[PDB]
PDB file of all heavy atoms in Angstrom:
ATOM      1  N   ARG B  87      22.079 -28.078  39.674  1.00 15.52           N
ATOM      2  CA  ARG B  87      21.089 -27.320  38.816  1.00 15.52           C
ATOM      3  C   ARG B  87      21.667 -26.461  37.837  1.00 15.52           C
ATOM      4  O   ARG B  87      20.941 -25.556  37.418  1.00 15.52           O
ATOM      5  CB  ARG B  87      20.171 -26.630  39.931  1.00 15.52           C
ATOM      6  CG  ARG B  87      20.905 -25.565  40.693  1.00 15.52           C
ATOM      7  CD  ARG B  87      20.004 -24.936  41.734  1.00 15.52           C
ATOM      8  NE  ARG B  87      20.654 -23.817  42.460  1.00 15.52           N
ATOM      9  CZ  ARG B  87      20.550 -22.581  42.116  1.00 15.52           C
ATOM     10  NH1 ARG B  87      20.036 -22.202  41.063  1.00 15.52           N
ATOM     11  NH2 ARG B  87      21.173 -21.704  42.972  1.00 15.52           N
ATOM     12  N   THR B  88      22.938 -26.683  37.350  1.00 16.95           N
ATOM     13  CA  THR B  88      23.661 -25.925  36.441  1.00 16.95           C
ATOM     14  C   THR B  88      24.301 -24.648  36.997  1.00 16.95           C
ATOM     15  O   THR B  88      25.322 -24.204  36.479  1.00 16.95           O
ATOM     16  CB  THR B  88      22.958 -25.407  35.198  1.00 16.95           C
ATOM     17  OG1 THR B  88      21.879 -24.502  35.564  1.00 16.95           O
ATOM     18  CG2 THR B  88      22.374 -26.511  34.338  1.00 16.95           C
ATOM     19  N   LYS B 150      54.913  -6.968  77.991  1.00 20.64           N
ATOM     20  CA  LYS B 150      53.658  -6.379  78.215  1.00 20.64           C
ATOM     21  C   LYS B 150      52.906  -5.959  76.975  1.00 20.64           C
ATOM     22  O   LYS B 150      51.739  -5.692  76.921  1.00 20.64           O
ATOM     23  CB  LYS B 150      53.678  -5.262  79.196  1.00 20.64           C
ATOM     24  CG  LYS B 150      54.441  -4.060  78.705  1.00 20.64           C
ATOM     25  CD  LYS B 150      53.512  -2.942  78.219  1.00 20.64           C
ATOM     26  CE  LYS B 150      54.266  -1.711  77.907  1.00 20.64           C
ATOM     27  NZ  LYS B 150      53.273  -0.583  77.450  1.00 20.64           N
ATOM     28  N   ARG B 161      44.536 -18.610  71.571  1.00 18.47           N
ATOM     29  CA  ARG B 161      45.039 -19.803  71.004  1.00 18.47           C
ATOM     30  C   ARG B 161      44.195 -20.248  69.794  1.00 18.47           C
ATOM     31  O   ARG B 161      43.009 -20.166  69.839  1.00 18.47           O
ATOM     32  CB  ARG B 161      45.065 -20.926  72.080  1.00 18.47           C
ATOM     33  CG  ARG B 161      43.762 -21.112  72.813  1.00 18.47           C
ATOM     34  CD  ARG B 161      43.871 -22.021  73.910  1.00 18.47           C
ATOM     35  NE  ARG B 161      44.602 -21.492  75.039  1.00 18.47           N
ATOM     36  CZ  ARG B 161      44.396 -21.816  76.400  1.00 18.47           C
ATOM     37  NH1 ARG B 161      43.499 -22.613  76.683  1.00 18.47           N
ATOM     38  NH2 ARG B 161      45.151 -21.185  77.351  1.00 18.47           N
ATOM     39  N   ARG B 166      40.893 -19.246  63.400  1.00 22.97           N
ATOM     40  CA  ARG B 166      39.607 -18.679  63.684  1.00 22.97           C
ATOM     41  C   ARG B 166      39.482 -17.249  63.129  1.00 22.97           C
ATOM     42  O   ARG B 166      38.574 -16.523  63.579  1.00 22.97           O
ATOM     43  CB  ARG B 166      39.337 -18.576  65.156  1.00 22.97           C
ATOM     44  CG  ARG B 166      39.661 -19.935  65.888  1.00 22.97           C
ATOM     45  CD  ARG B 166      39.056 -20.197  67.226  1.00 22.97           C
ATOM     46  NE  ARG B 166      38.962 -18.914  67.976  1.00 22.97           N
ATOM     47  CZ  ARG B 166      39.939 -18.435  68.707  1.00 22.97           C
ATOM     48  NH1 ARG B 166      41.156 -19.033  68.746  1.00 22.97           N
ATOM     49  NH2 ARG B 166      39.808 -17.198  69.382  1.00 22.97           N
ATOM     50  N   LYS B 168      41.423 -14.454  63.189  1.00 19.53           N
ATOM     51  CA  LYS B 168      41.618 -13.317  64.104  1.00 19.53           C
ATOM     52  C   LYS B 168      42.921 -12.534  63.752  1.00 19.53           C
ATOM     53  O   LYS B 168      43.140 -11.653  64.515  1.00 19.53           O
ATOM     54  CB  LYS B 168      41.665 -13.843  65.546  1.00 19.53           C
ATOM     55  CG  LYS B 168      40.359 -14.275  66.085  1.00 19.53           C
ATOM     56  CD  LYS B 168      40.376 -14.348  67.595  1.00 19.53           C
ATOM     57  CE  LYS B 168      40.569 -13.025  68.186  1.00 19.53           C
ATOM     58  NZ  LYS B 168      40.504 -13.170  69.708  1.00 19.53           N
ATOM     59  N   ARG B 176      37.198 -11.682  56.473  1.00 19.92           N
ATOM     60  CA  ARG B 176      35.881 -11.721  57.055  1.00 19.92           C
ATOM     61  C   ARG B 176      35.094 -10.456  56.816  1.00 19.92           C
ATOM     62  O   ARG B 176      33.963 -10.294  57.317  1.00 19.92           O
ATOM     63  CB  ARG B 176      36.050 -11.914  58.584  1.00 19.92           C
ATOM     64  CG  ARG B 176      36.670 -13.270  59.004  1.00 19.92           C
ATOM     65  CD  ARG B 176      37.205 -13.152  60.364  1.00 19.92           C
ATOM     66  NE  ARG B 176      36.257 -13.163  61.374  1.00 19.92           N
ATOM     67  CZ  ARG B 176      36.448 -12.877  62.625  1.00 19.92           C
ATOM     68  NH1 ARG B 176      37.656 -12.468  63.033  1.00 19.92           N
ATOM     69  NH2 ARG B 176      35.534 -12.976  63.516  1.00 19.92           N
ATOM     70  N   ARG B 181      34.691  -0.234  58.591  1.00 18.73           N
ATOM     71  CA  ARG B 181      33.475   0.020  59.324  1.00 18.73           C
ATOM     72  C   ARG B 181      32.428   0.626  58.492  1.00 18.73           C
ATOM     73  O   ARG B 181      32.619   1.038  57.192  1.00 18.73           O
ATOM     74  CB  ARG B 181      33.703   1.008  60.522  1.00 18.73           C
ATOM     75  CG  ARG B 181      34.790   0.541  61.490  1.00 18.73           C
ATOM     76  CD  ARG B 181      34.645   1.381  62.659  1.00 18.73           C
ATOM     77  NE  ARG B 181      35.726   1.084  63.706  1.00 18.73           N
ATOM     78  CZ  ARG B 181      35.661   1.330  64.973  1.00 18.73           C
ATOM     79  NH1 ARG B 181      34.607   1.905  65.496  1.00 18.73           N
ATOM     80  NH2 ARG B 181      36.725   1.096  65.705  1.00 18.73           N
ATOM     81  N   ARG B 189      30.280  -7.846  60.434  1.00 16.31           N
ATOM     82  CA  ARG B 189      30.628  -7.648  61.792  1.00 16.31           C
ATOM     83  C   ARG B 189      29.418  -7.946  62.715  1.00 16.31           C
ATOM     84  O   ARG B 189      28.318  -7.440  62.303  1.00 16.31           O
ATOM     85  CB  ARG B 189      31.193  -6.257  62.131  1.00 16.31           C
ATOM     86  CG  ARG B 189      31.544  -6.024  63.626  1.00 16.31           C
ATOM     87  CD  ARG B 189      32.181  -4.756  63.749  1.00 16.31           C
ATOM     88  NE  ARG B 189      33.625  -4.592  63.366  1.00 16.31           N
ATOM     89  CZ  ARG B 189      33.964  -4.198  62.199  1.00 16.31           C
ATOM     90  NH1 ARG B 189      33.181  -3.927  61.233  1.00 16.31           N
ATOM     91  NH2 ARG B 189      35.263  -4.176  61.843  1.00 16.31           N
ATOM     92  N   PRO B 190      29.495  -8.624  63.856  1.00 17.39           N
ATOM     93  CA  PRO B 190      30.720  -9.137  64.527  1.00 17.39           C
ATOM     94  C   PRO B 190      31.329 -10.386  63.958  1.00 17.39           C
ATOM     95  O   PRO B 190      32.326 -10.761  64.339  1.00 17.39           O
ATOM     96  CB  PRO B 190      30.186  -9.225  65.951  1.00 17.39           C
ATOM     97  CG  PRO B 190      28.803  -9.684  65.751  1.00 17.39           C
ATOM     98  CD  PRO B 190      28.285  -8.973  64.595  1.00 17.39           C
TER      99      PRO B 190
ATOM    100  P     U D   3      19.330 -22.604  37.545  1.00  2.00           P
ATOM    101  OP1   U D   3      20.775 -22.939  37.257  1.00  2.00           O
ATOM    102  OP2   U D   3      18.701 -23.229  38.713  1.00  2.00           O
ATOM    103  O5'   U D   3      19.364 -21.068  37.782  1.00  2.00           O
ATOM    104  C5'   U D   3      20.133 -20.239  37.023  1.00  2.00           C
ATOM    105  C4'   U D   3      19.791 -18.822  37.169  1.00  2.00           C
ATOM    106  O4'   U D   3      18.536 -18.513  36.483  1.00  2.00           O
ATOM    107  C3'   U D   3      19.466 -18.325  38.589  1.00  2.00           C
ATOM    108  O3'   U D   3      20.698 -18.029  39.310  1.00  2.00           O
ATOM    109  C2'   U D   3      18.632 -17.006  38.319  1.00  2.00           C
ATOM    110  O2'   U D   3      19.452 -15.942  37.936  1.00  2.00           O
ATOM    111  C1'   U D   3      17.833 -17.459  37.105  1.00  2.00           C
ATOM    112  N1    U D   3      16.462 -17.960  37.457  1.00  2.00           N
ATOM    113  C2    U D   3      15.553 -17.008  37.746  1.00  2.00           C
ATOM    114  O2    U D   3      15.741 -15.845  37.673  1.00  2.00           O
ATOM    115  N3    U D   3      14.336 -17.589  38.086  1.00  2.00           N
ATOM    116  C4    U D   3      13.915 -18.793  38.174  1.00  2.00           C
ATOM    117  O4    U D   3      12.734 -19.100  38.363  1.00  2.00           O
ATOM    118  C5    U D   3      14.952 -19.753  37.869  1.00  2.00           C
ATOM    119  C6    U D   3      16.083 -19.234  37.434  1.00  2.00           C
ATOM    120  P     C D   4      20.717 -18.309  40.912  1.00  2.00           P
ATOM    121  OP1   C D   4      21.740 -17.368  41.405  1.00  2.00           O
ATOM    122  OP2   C D   4      20.880 -19.628  41.065  1.00  2.00           O
ATOM    123  O5'   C D   4      19.356 -17.802  41.454  1.00  2.00           O
ATOM    124  C5'   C D   4      18.976 -16.574  41.777  1.00  2.00           C
ATOM    125  C4'   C D   4      17.465 -16.385  42.080  1.00  2.00           C
ATOM    126  O4'   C D   4      16.649 -17.083  40.981  1.00  2.00           O
ATOM    127  C3'   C D   4      17.020 -17.066  43.369  1.00  2.00           C
ATOM    128  O3'   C D   4      17.354 -16.282  44.514  1.00  2.00           O
ATOM    129  C2'   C D   4      15.549 -17.199  43.130  1.00  2.00           C
ATOM    130  O2'   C D   4      14.881 -15.956  43.270  1.00  2.00           O
ATOM    131  C1'   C D   4      15.560 -17.527  41.607  1.00  2.00           C
ATOM    132  N1    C D   4      15.450 -18.965  41.332  1.00  2.00           N
ATOM    133  C2    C D   4      14.291 -19.711  41.652  1.00  2.00           C
ATOM    134  O2    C D   4      13.400 -19.024  42.137  1.00  2.00           O
ATOM    135  N3    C D   4      14.165 -21.053  41.535  1.00  2.00           N
ATOM    136  C4    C D   4      15.235 -21.660  40.956  1.00  2.00           C
ATOM    137  N4    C D   4      15.082 -23.014  40.772  1.00  2.00           N
ATOM    138  C5    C D   4      16.463 -21.054  40.636  1.00  2.00           C
ATOM    139  C6    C D   4      16.512 -19.754  40.855  1.00  2.00           C
ATOM    140  P     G D  17      40.553 -23.836  74.651  1.00  2.00           P
ATOM    141  OP1   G D  17      41.978 -23.842  75.350  1.00  2.00           O
ATOM    142  OP2   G D  17      39.850 -25.075  74.373  1.00  2.00           O
ATOM    143  O5'   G D  17      39.644 -22.894  75.522  1.00  2.00           O
ATOM    144  C5'   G D  17      39.820 -21.460  75.610  1.00  2.00           C
ATOM    145  C4'   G D  17      38.620 -20.802  76.187  1.00  2.00           C
ATOM    146  O4'   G D  17      37.593 -20.907  75.313  1.00  2.00           O
ATOM    147  C3'   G D  17      38.133 -21.376  77.555  1.00  2.00           C
ATOM    148  O3'   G D  17      38.849 -20.801  78.620  1.00  2.00           O
ATOM    149  C2'   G D  17      36.639 -20.974  77.489  1.00  2.00           C
ATOM    150  O2'   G D  17      36.510 -19.548  77.865  1.00  2.00           O
ATOM    151  C1'   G D  17      36.390 -21.044  76.012  1.00  2.00           C
ATOM    152  N9    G D  17      35.792 -22.379  75.649  1.00  2.00           N
ATOM    153  C8    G D  17      36.385 -23.604  75.514  1.00  2.00           C
ATOM    154  N7    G D  17      35.625 -24.577  75.119  1.00  2.00           N
ATOM    155  C5    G D  17      34.356 -23.960  74.939  1.00  2.00           C
ATOM    156  C6    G D  17      33.101 -24.445  74.599  1.00  2.00           C
ATOM    157  O6    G D  17      32.865 -25.592  74.240  1.00  2.00           O
ATOM    158  N1    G D  17      32.136 -23.561  74.534  1.00  2.00           N
ATOM    159  C2    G D  17      32.344 -22.214  74.895  1.00  2.00           C
ATOM    160  N2    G D  17      31.250 -21.381  74.740  1.00  2.00           N
ATOM    161  N3    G D  17      33.459 -21.694  75.239  1.00  2.00           N
ATOM    162  C4    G D  17      34.462 -22.567  75.258  1.00  2.00           C
ATOM    163  P     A D  21      37.556 -14.790  70.889  1.00  2.00           P
ATOM    164  OP1   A D  21      38.895 -15.111  70.404  1.00  2.00           O
ATOM    165  OP2   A D  21      37.373 -13.933  72.045  1.00  2.00           O
ATOM    166  O5'   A D  21      36.725 -14.094  69.652  1.00  2.00           O
ATOM    167  C5'   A D  21      36.618 -14.667  68.478  1.00  2.00           C
ATOM    168  C4'   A D  21      35.474 -14.178  67.733  1.00  2.00           C
ATOM    169  O4'   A D  21      34.240 -14.414  68.371  1.00  2.00           O
ATOM    170  C3'   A D  21      35.491 -12.602  67.476  1.00  2.00           C
ATOM    171  O3'   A D  21      36.366 -12.242  66.377  1.00  2.00           O
ATOM    172  C2'   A D  21      33.995 -12.349  67.217  1.00  2.00           C
ATOM    173  O2'   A D  21      33.620 -12.660  65.852  1.00  2.00           O
ATOM    174  C1'   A D  21      33.362 -13.365  68.169  1.00  2.00           C
ATOM    175  N9    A D  21      33.049 -12.716  69.526  1.00  2.00           N
ATOM    176  C8    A D  21      33.775 -12.961  70.665  1.00  2.00           C
ATOM    177  N7    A D  21      33.309 -12.241  71.688  1.00  2.00           N
ATOM    178  C5    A D  21      32.295 -11.560  71.115  1.00  2.00           C
ATOM    179  C6    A D  21      31.444 -10.538  71.675  1.00  2.00           C
ATOM    180  N6    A D  21      31.447 -10.222  72.916  1.00  2.00           N
ATOM    181  N1    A D  21      30.537  -9.900  70.892  1.00  2.00           N
ATOM    182  C2    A D  21      30.487 -10.259  69.578  1.00  2.00           C
ATOM    183  N3    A D  21      31.277 -11.232  69.001  1.00  2.00           N
ATOM    184  C4    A D  21      32.144 -11.760  69.793  1.00  2.00           C
ATOM    185  P     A D  22      37.241 -10.882  66.560  1.00  2.00           P
ATOM    186  OP1   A D  22      38.076 -10.842  65.321  1.00  2.00           O
ATOM    187  OP2   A D  22      37.882 -10.943  67.910  1.00  2.00           O
ATOM    188  O5'   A D  22      36.130  -9.748  66.617  1.00  2.00           O
ATOM    189  C5'   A D  22      35.403  -9.354  65.482  1.00  2.00           C
ATOM    190  C4'   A D  22      34.332  -8.257  65.808  1.00  2.00           C
ATOM    191  O4'   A D  22      33.568  -8.793  66.910  1.00  2.00           O
ATOM    192  C3'   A D  22      35.063  -7.059  66.364  1.00  2.00           C
ATOM    193  O3'   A D  22      35.437  -6.132  65.337  1.00  2.00           O
ATOM    194  C2'   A D  22      33.891  -6.509  67.296  1.00  2.00           C
ATOM    195  O2'   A D  22      32.951  -5.768  66.534  1.00  2.00           O
ATOM    196  C1'   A D  22      33.286  -7.784  67.750  1.00  2.00           C
ATOM    197  N9    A D  22      33.842  -8.268  69.145  1.00  2.00           N
ATOM    198  C8    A D  22      34.546  -9.304  69.297  1.00  2.00           C
ATOM    199  N7    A D  22      34.916  -9.527  70.576  1.00  2.00           N
ATOM    200  C5    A D  22      34.271  -8.560  71.231  1.00  2.00           C
ATOM    201  C6    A D  22      34.177  -8.259  72.627  1.00  2.00           C
ATOM    202  N6    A D  22      34.714  -8.959  73.562  1.00  2.00           N
ATOM    203  N1    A D  22      33.312  -7.207  72.943  1.00  2.00           N
ATOM    204  C2    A D  22      32.674  -6.503  71.980  1.00  2.00           C
ATOM    205  N3    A D  22      32.824  -6.700  70.618  1.00  2.00           N
ATOM    206  C4    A D  22      33.492  -7.720  70.331  1.00  2.00           C
ATOM    207  P     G D  23      36.876  -5.586  65.286  1.00  2.00           P
ATOM    208  OP1   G D  23      37.086  -5.156  63.893  1.00  2.00           O
ATOM    209  OP2   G D  23      37.815  -6.594  65.811  1.00  2.00           O
ATOM    210  O5'   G D  23      36.937  -4.369  66.192  1.00  2.00           O
ATOM    211  C5'   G D  23      35.853  -3.392  66.219  1.00  2.00           C
ATOM    212  C4'   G D  23      35.672  -2.760  67.424  1.00  2.00           C
ATOM    213  O4'   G D  23      34.985  -3.704  68.317  1.00  2.00           O
ATOM    214  C3'   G D  23      36.793  -2.312  68.212  1.00  2.00           C
ATOM    215  O3'   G D  23      37.340  -1.092  67.784  1.00  2.00           O
ATOM    216  C2'   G D  23      36.324  -2.281  69.642  1.00  2.00           C
ATOM    217  O2'   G D  23      35.652  -1.117  69.973  1.00  2.00           O
ATOM    218  C1'   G D  23      35.438  -3.478  69.657  1.00  2.00           C
ATOM    219  N9    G D  23      36.025  -4.714  70.109  1.00  2.00           N
ATOM    220  C8    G D  23      36.607  -5.753  69.341  1.00  2.00           C
ATOM    221  N7    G D  23      37.082  -6.675  70.077  1.00  2.00           N
ATOM    222  C5    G D  23      36.881  -6.305  71.441  1.00  2.00           C
ATOM    223  C6    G D  23      37.162  -6.923  72.578  1.00  2.00           C
ATOM    224  O6    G D  23      37.727  -7.927  72.867  1.00  2.00           O
ATOM    225  N1    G D  23      36.642  -6.151  73.697  1.00  2.00           N
ATOM    226  C2    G D  23      35.973  -4.955  73.639  1.00  2.00           C
ATOM    227  N2    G D  23      35.589  -4.346  74.771  1.00  2.00           N
ATOM    228  N3    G D  23      35.746  -4.368  72.507  1.00  2.00           N
ATOM    229  C4    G D  23      36.220  -5.103  71.462  1.00  2.00           C
ATOM    230  P     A D  24      38.905  -0.957  67.086  1.00  2.00           P
ATOM    231  OP1   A D  24      38.775   0.001  66.028  1.00  2.00           O
ATOM    232  OP2   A D  24      39.395  -2.318  66.754  1.00  2.00           O
ATOM    233  O5'   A D  24      39.721  -0.317  68.167  1.00  2.00           O
ATOM    234  C5'   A D  24      40.221   0.990  68.085  1.00  2.00           C
ATOM    235  C4'   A D  24      39.144   2.037  68.318  1.00  2.00           C
ATOM    236  O4'   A D  24      38.080   1.388  69.181  1.00  2.00           O
ATOM    237  C3'   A D  24      39.529   3.268  69.072  1.00  2.00           C
ATOM    238  O3'   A D  24      38.827   4.358  68.663  1.00  2.00           O
ATOM    239  C2'   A D  24      39.131   2.905  70.630  1.00  2.00           C
ATOM    240  O2'   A D  24      39.080   4.040  71.401  1.00  2.00           O
ATOM    241  C1'   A D  24      37.887   2.070  70.337  1.00  2.00           C
ATOM    242  N9    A D  24      37.707   1.089  71.507  1.00  2.00           N
ATOM    243  C8    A D  24      38.214  -0.218  71.410  1.00  2.00           C
ATOM    244  N7    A D  24      37.872  -0.787  72.539  1.00  2.00           N
ATOM    245  C5    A D  24      37.267   0.124  73.342  1.00  2.00           C
ATOM    246  C6    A D  24      36.746   0.056  74.635  1.00  2.00           C
ATOM    247  N6    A D  24      36.773  -1.002  75.365  1.00  2.00           N
ATOM    248  N1    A D  24      36.171   1.152  75.131  1.00  2.00           N
ATOM    249  C2    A D  24      36.098   2.244  74.334  1.00  2.00           C
ATOM    250  N3    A D  24      36.524   2.415  73.105  1.00  2.00           N
ATOM    251  C4    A D  24      37.127   1.251  72.637  1.00  2.00           C
ATOM    252  P     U D  71      48.402   3.587  76.141  1.00  2.00           P
ATOM    253  OP1   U D  71      49.358   3.776  77.259  1.00  2.00           O
ATOM    254  OP2   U D  71      48.258   4.616  75.072  1.00  2.00           O
ATOM    255  O5'   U D  71      48.898   2.250  75.452  1.00  2.00           O
ATOM    256  C5'   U D  71      49.196   1.075  76.243  1.00  2.00           C
ATOM    257  C4'   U D  71      49.603  -0.095  75.354  1.00  2.00           C
ATOM    258  O4'   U D  71      48.569  -0.481  74.452  1.00  2.00           O
ATOM    259  C3'   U D  71      50.821   0.246  74.433  1.00  2.00           C
ATOM    260  O3'   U D  71      52.030   0.218  75.076  1.00  2.00           O
ATOM    261  C2'   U D  71      50.693  -0.860  73.356  1.00  2.00           C
ATOM    262  O2'   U D  71      51.154  -2.113  73.757  1.00  2.00           O
ATOM    263  C1'   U D  71      49.116  -0.938  73.255  1.00  2.00           C
ATOM    264  N1    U D  71      48.585  -0.082  72.121  1.00  2.00           N
ATOM    265  C2    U D  71      48.667  -0.622  70.877  1.00  2.00           C
ATOM    266  O2    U D  71      49.209  -1.728  70.575  1.00  2.00           O
ATOM    267  N3    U D  71      48.088   0.223  69.863  1.00  2.00           N
ATOM    268  C4    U D  71      47.490   1.431  70.055  1.00  2.00           C
ATOM    269  O4    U D  71      47.082   2.004  69.096  1.00  2.00           O
ATOM    270  C5    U D  71      47.412   1.862  71.430  1.00  2.00           C
ATOM    271  C6    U D  71      47.957   1.061  72.439  1.00  2.00           C
ATOM    272  P     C D  72      53.213   0.998  74.359  1.00  3.87           P
ATOM    273  OP1   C D  72      54.325   1.078  75.387  1.00  3.87           O
ATOM    274  OP2   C D  72      52.810   2.200  73.741  1.00  3.87           O
ATOM    275  O5'   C D  72      53.799  -0.075  73.335  1.00  3.87           O
ATOM    276  C5'   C D  72      54.259   0.301  72.057  1.00  3.87           C
ATOM    277  C4'   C D  72      54.066  -0.750  71.073  1.00  3.87           C
ATOM    278  O4'   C D  72      52.674  -0.762  70.533  1.00  3.87           O
ATOM    279  C3'   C D  72      54.951  -0.657  69.727  1.00  3.87           C
ATOM    280  O3'   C D  72      56.197  -1.263  69.992  1.00  3.87           O
ATOM    281  C2'   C D  72      54.067  -1.331  68.724  1.00  3.87           C
ATOM    282  O2'   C D  72      54.251  -2.704  68.696  1.00  3.87           O
ATOM    283  C1'   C D  72      52.584  -1.037  69.201  1.00  3.87           C
ATOM    284  N1    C D  72      51.963   0.082  68.484  1.00  3.87           N
ATOM    285  C2    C D  72      51.835   0.208  67.083  1.00  3.87           C
ATOM    286  O2    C D  72      52.448  -0.706  66.432  1.00  3.87           O
ATOM    287  N3    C D  72      51.237   1.171  66.528  1.00  3.87           N
ATOM    288  C4    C D  72      50.609   2.116  67.251  1.00  3.87           C
ATOM    289  N4    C D  72      50.101   3.156  66.706  1.00  3.87           N
ATOM    290  C5    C D  72      50.545   2.079  68.629  1.00  3.87           C
ATOM    291  C6    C D  72      51.301   1.043  69.199  1.00  3.87           C
TER     292        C D  72
END
Side-chain angles (χ1 to χ4, degrees):
Chain B
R87 61 185 185 90
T88 63
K150 64 101 172 184
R161 51 191 73 151
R166 314 197 325 274
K168 292 196 65 180
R176 297 157 75 196
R181 307 192 182 202
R189 181 175 283 95

